[PDB]
């Protein structure tokens, strides 16, 4: 039998969050699966909706609502990504990217998952193109890694032997240098 | 014409022997031959082999033929094998090979003709199948030796190319490395 019930992911929109929150773009994922999923009617969305929000986020929920009562839940969370949703120039997501460097006592494959994320967000913002995420993702790993240098040999031929590799081939190459010998 | 007699081999028993004594298994060896091949009346084989004996094992030769004047050389051997021979757990046999690495300012040829020795005597006293000692003395030097990184991309390539190498090939492929150009 499916086990207890899940709890909701919360949100502040404060400059510092707890650390339990999440990213305004995951719990905009729950308040949309919220607004066009549940078989459920508005007053009670619209409880399950302010029943998730915290910090700052929640105080303007009420001043939205006061000024215009015609407003449905697809309207109002209109309103809510004005105010607490991102900007980002295309020159801000190319920058950000390409400045990633591997950090203290951080593994290979670690950075290599870490730098991933970022890739997504600059093809997006059509910064990169497309076409060529693949070459610029490996370019971007010699640059930014400290490699041993058997696994310098590899990454050396997956850069010559034909097209370059996918995300999950890399990582497998990677896994396999990363291990080490008990004494 | 062949050349002058050869002296005998010779052992102490001694908790620390002279540096020109042999170890026990190889005094047995000239033992074995005295009393199997040598065509000799049985108080001048029991005169050349009294002959070898120093230190306390000399001793013990005497008290044993008084309490038993019937004794052949056949017997009185398997009493000296008793009293100075070896006893060794098969878990001594396999921990003392598997913890055994490369020493300060020697050679790696050096070192691999070392570990041969131990890997015998783990493969007797059935701690290693016979079956795969060749693989197991390849994960042991790459794991005890401090390679260069031109003898690592070799061994790695050994690794992997075919069934793993016998000893005469593993000692042949590091000597090729170890040699240097002078200036």
Known sequence: LPMRYR????FSGSAVPAPEEE?????????????????????????W????????????????QADNPSISVEE???????????????RTAQVRYLKTYQEEGEKVSAYVLRLETLLRRAVEKRAIP??????????????????????????????????????????????EEEEEEAS
């Open 49 to 64: 909706l302010a029943e998730s929000l915290r910090g700052p986020a929640l105080d303007l929920m009420h001043i939205v």
């Open 130 to 175: 497309r076409r060529i995420a693949d070459q610029v993702r490996l370019e971007q790993v010699m640059a930014g890694a400290t490699l041993n240098q058997m696994l310098w040999c590899r990454l050396r031929e997956l850069k010559d032997q034909g097209p370059p590799p996918s995300f999950l081939e890399l990582m497998k190459v990677i896994r």
């Open 7 to 10: 709890k909701l992911r919360v």
């Open 23 to 47: 990213s305004f773009e995951v719990w905009l994922e729950q308040a949309t699966e919220i607004v066009k999923e549940w078989p459920v009617t508005e007053a009670e969305k619209k409880r």
């Open 76 to 90: 109002c969370l209109e309103a809510f990504k004005q105010v607490f949703g991102s900007l980002e120039s295309r």
